Protein backbone atom coordinates (compact mmCIF):
# COMPACT_ATOMS: atom_id res chain seq x y z
CA UNK A 1 0.00 0.00 0.00
CA UNK A 2 0.83 3.74 -0.29
CA UNK A 3 3.67 3.46 -2.78
CA UNK A 4 4.51 7.15 -2.30
CA UNK A 5 5.71 6.41 1.22
CA UNK A 6 8.98 4.73 0.20
CA UNK A 7 9.43 7.05 -2.79
CA UNK A 8 8.89 10.08 -0.54
CA UNK A 9 11.32 8.59 1.95
CA UNK A 10 13.78 7.91 -0.89
CA UNK A 11 13.38 11.37 -2.40
CA UNK A 12 14.15 13.17 0.88
CA UNK A 13 17.06 10.92 1.86
CA UNK A 14 18.87 11.17 -1.48
CA UNK A 15 18.53 14.95 -1.58
CA UNK A 16 19.99 15.29 1.93
CA UNK A 17 22.93 13.00 1.25
CA UNK A 18 23.46 15.05 -1.90
CA UNK A 19 23.59 18.21 0.20
CA UNK A 20 25.37 16.71 3.22
CA UNK A 21 28.08 15.46 0.91
CA UNK A 22 29.17 19.05 0.18
CA UNK A 23 30.35 19.26 3.80
CA UNK A 24 33.57 17.17 3.84
CA UNK A 25 33.27 16.73 7.62
CA UNK A 26 29.60 15.58 7.69
CA UNK A 27 28.67 12.22 9.20
CA UNK A 28 27.25 11.17 5.79
CA UNK A 29 30.84 10.11 5.00
CA UNK A 30 31.48 7.75 7.90
CA UNK A 31 28.91 5.47 6.20
CA UNK A 32 31.47 3.81 3.92
CA UNK A 33 32.61 1.21 6.44
CA UNK A 34 34.39 -0.94 3.84
CA UNK A 35 36.49 2.09 2.77
CA UNK A 36 39.17 2.48 5.43
CA UNK A 37 40.41 6.09 5.45
CA UNK A 38 38.80 7.59 2.36
CA UNK A 39 41.02 9.43 -0.12
CA UNK A 40 40.23 12.28 -2.49
CA UNK A 41 39.42 10.07 -5.49
CA UNK A 42 36.71 8.56 -3.28
CA UNK A 43 34.83 11.80 -2.74
CA UNK A 44 34.66 12.80 -6.38
CA UNK A 45 33.30 9.26 -6.93
CA UNK A 46 30.79 9.36 -4.08
CA UNK A 47 29.67 12.86 -4.97
CA UNK A 48 28.71 11.94 -8.57
CA UNK A 49 27.09 8.66 -7.55
CA UNK A 50 25.00 10.53 -5.00
CA UNK A 51 23.76 12.97 -7.63
CA UNK A 52 22.56 10.18 -9.93
CA UNK A 53 20.93 8.52 -6.93
CA UNK A 54 18.98 11.71 -6.14
CA UNK A 55 17.78 11.86 -9.76
CA UNK A 56 16.34 8.34 -9.84
CA UNK A 57 14.59 9.06 -6.56
CA UNK A 58 13.13 12.10 -8.35
CA UNK A 59 11.79 9.95 -11.21
CA UNK A 60 10.46 7.11 -9.02
CA UNK A 61 8.55 9.62 -6.89
CA UNK A 62 6.98 11.31 -9.92
CA UNK A 63 5.87 7.93 -11.28
CA UNK A 64 4.04 7.11 -8.04
CA UNK A 65 2.38 10.53 -8.21
Amino acid sequence: FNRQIPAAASLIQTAWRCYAAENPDSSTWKIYIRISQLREHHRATIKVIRRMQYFVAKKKFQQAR
Binding site: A7, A8, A9, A15, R17, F55, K58
Partner: protein, 143 residues
Amino acid sequence: LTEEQIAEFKEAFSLFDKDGDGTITTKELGTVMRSLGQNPTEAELQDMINEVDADGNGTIDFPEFLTMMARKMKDTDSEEEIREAFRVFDKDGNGYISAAELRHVMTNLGEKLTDEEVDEMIREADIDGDGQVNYEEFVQMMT
Protein backbone atom coordinates in the same frame (compact mmCIF):
# COMPACT_ATOMS: atom_id res chain seq x y z
CA LEU B 1 30.13 27.50 -16.02
CA THR B 2 33.66 27.59 -14.60
CA GLU B 3 36.81 26.23 -16.19
CA GLU B 4 37.67 25.01 -12.70
CA GLN B 5 34.34 23.16 -12.54
CA ILE B 6 34.68 21.49 -15.95
CA ALA B 7 38.29 20.54 -15.15
CA GLU B 8 37.31 18.74 -11.98
CA PHE B 9 34.33 17.08 -13.67
CA LYS B 10 36.74 15.89 -16.37
CA GLU B 11 38.87 14.37 -13.60
CA ALA B 12 35.72 12.78 -12.12
CA PHE B 13 34.58 11.36 -15.47
CA SER B 14 37.97 9.65 -15.84
CA LEU B 15 37.38 7.94 -12.52
CA PHE B 16 34.46 6.06 -14.05
CA ASP B 17 35.78 5.91 -17.64
CA LYS B 18 38.65 3.48 -17.20
CA ASP B 19 38.87 2.06 -20.75
CA GLY B 20 39.28 5.61 -22.11
CA ASP B 21 36.41 5.22 -24.61
CA GLY B 22 34.63 8.36 -23.37
CA THR B 23 31.59 6.27 -22.39
CA ILE B 24 30.37 5.14 -18.96
CA THR B 25 28.58 1.79 -19.18
CA THR B 26 26.31 0.32 -16.50
CA LYS B 27 29.09 -2.21 -15.70
CA GLU B 28 31.83 0.40 -15.22
CA LEU B 29 29.64 2.33 -12.77
CA GLY B 30 29.02 -0.82 -10.76
CA THR B 31 32.75 -1.34 -10.48
CA VAL B 32 33.09 2.07 -8.83
CA MET B 33 30.13 1.60 -6.47
CA ARG B 34 31.37 -1.86 -5.52
CA SER B 35 34.77 -0.27 -4.91
CA LEU B 36 33.13 1.73 -2.13
CA GLY B 37 31.78 -1.30 -0.34
CA GLN B 38 28.45 -1.39 -2.17
CA ASN B 39 26.30 -3.99 -3.88
CA PRO B 40 23.98 -2.68 -6.59
CA THR B 41 21.49 -4.67 -8.61
CA GLU B 42 21.63 -4.89 -12.41
CA ALA B 43 18.48 -2.73 -12.54
CA GLU B 44 19.79 -0.15 -10.03
CA LEU B 45 22.76 0.22 -12.36
CA GLN B 46 20.33 0.39 -15.29
CA ASP B 47 18.09 3.02 -13.63
CA MET B 48 21.00 5.40 -12.82
CA ILE B 49 22.23 5.38 -16.43
CA ASN B 50 18.73 5.77 -17.83
CA GLU B 51 18.35 8.95 -15.78
CA VAL B 52 21.52 10.57 -17.17
CA ASP B 53 20.93 9.09 -20.68
CA ALA B 54 19.77 11.61 -23.29
CA ASP B 55 21.30 9.74 -26.26
CA GLY B 56 19.53 6.45 -25.53
CA ASN B 57 22.55 4.53 -26.67
CA GLY B 58 22.82 3.11 -23.17
CA THR B 59 26.09 4.87 -22.34
CA ILE B 60 27.15 8.07 -20.61
CA ASP B 61 29.26 10.36 -22.76
CA PHE B 62 31.17 13.14 -21.06
CA PRO B 63 28.64 15.78 -22.28
CA GLU B 64 25.80 13.97 -20.48
CA PHE B 65 27.86 13.68 -17.33
CA LEU B 66 28.37 17.43 -17.65
CA THR B 67 24.64 17.92 -18.20
CA MET B 68 23.94 15.96 -15.04
CA MET B 69 26.69 17.55 -12.97
CA ALA B 70 25.43 21.04 -13.82
CA ARG B 71 21.75 20.34 -13.35
CA LYS B 72 19.71 22.54 -11.03
CA MET B 73 19.43 20.07 -8.16
CA LYS B 74 17.96 23.05 -6.27
CA ASP B 75 16.21 25.31 -8.86
CA THR B 76 14.50 22.90 -11.31
CA ASP B 77 11.28 22.75 -9.20
CA SER B 78 13.43 20.64 -6.81
CA GLU B 79 11.71 22.45 -3.94
CA GLU B 80 8.14 21.60 -5.02
CA GLU B 81 8.63 17.83 -5.18
CA ILE B 82 10.67 17.73 -1.97
CA ARG B 83 7.83 19.65 -0.32
CA GLU B 84 5.14 17.24 -1.50
CA ALA B 85 7.38 14.32 -0.42
CA PHE B 86 7.14 15.63 3.16
CA ARG B 87 3.41 16.23 2.80
CA VAL B 88 3.05 12.46 2.34
CA PHE B 89 3.91 12.51 6.09
CA ASP B 90 2.01 15.57 7.42
CA LYS B 91 -1.43 13.99 7.58
CA ASP B 92 -2.12 16.58 10.29
CA GLY B 93 -1.69 19.05 7.41
CA ASN B 94 0.45 21.37 9.53
CA GLY B 95 3.70 22.24 7.79
CA TYR B 96 5.35 20.38 10.67
CA ILE B 97 6.61 16.80 11.13
CA SER B 98 7.62 15.33 14.55
CA ALA B 99 11.45 15.09 14.85
CA ALA B 100 10.76 11.57 16.20
CA GLU B 101 8.64 10.61 13.15
CA LEU B 102 11.40 12.18 10.99
CA ARG B 103 14.04 9.88 12.58
CA HIS B 104 11.70 6.85 12.18
CA VAL B 105 11.18 7.83 8.49
CA MET B 106 14.85 8.65 7.71
CA THR B 107 15.98 5.37 9.37
CA ASN B 108 13.41 2.64 8.70
CA LEU B 109 11.96 3.59 5.28
CA GLY B 110 13.62 4.10 1.86
CA GLU B 111 17.42 4.30 1.92
CA LYS B 112 17.49 3.98 5.74
CA LEU B 113 20.18 6.43 6.82
CA THR B 114 22.52 5.94 9.73
CA ASP B 115 21.55 7.41 13.07
CA GLU B 116 24.50 9.78 13.14
CA GLU B 117 23.29 11.25 9.83
CA VAL B 118 19.79 11.58 11.19
CA ASP B 119 21.26 13.24 14.29
CA GLU B 120 23.07 15.78 12.11
CA MET B 121 19.93 16.41 10.02
CA ILE B 122 17.46 17.07 12.91
CA ARG B 123 20.04 19.27 14.74
CA GLU B 124 20.72 21.48 11.66
CA ALA B 125 16.99 21.43 10.67
CA ASP B 126 14.19 23.65 12.08
CA ILE B 127 14.26 21.72 15.42
CA ASP B 128 14.86 24.77 17.70
CA GLY B 129 13.98 22.48 20.60
CA ASP B 130 10.48 22.18 19.25
CA GLY B 131 10.22 18.45 18.56
CA GLN B 132 8.54 19.39 15.31
CA VAL B 133 10.38 20.36 12.14
CA ASN B 134 8.64 22.79 9.81
CA TYR B 135 9.90 21.25 6.59
CA GLU B 136 9.57 24.68 4.95
CA GLU B 137 12.95 25.43 6.54
CA PHE B 138 14.14 21.92 5.65
CA VAL B 139 13.50 22.18 1.90
CA GLN B 140 15.36 25.46 1.93
CA MET B 141 18.30 23.96 3.84
CA MET B 142 19.04 21.72 0.87
CA THR B 143 18.46 24.48 -1.70
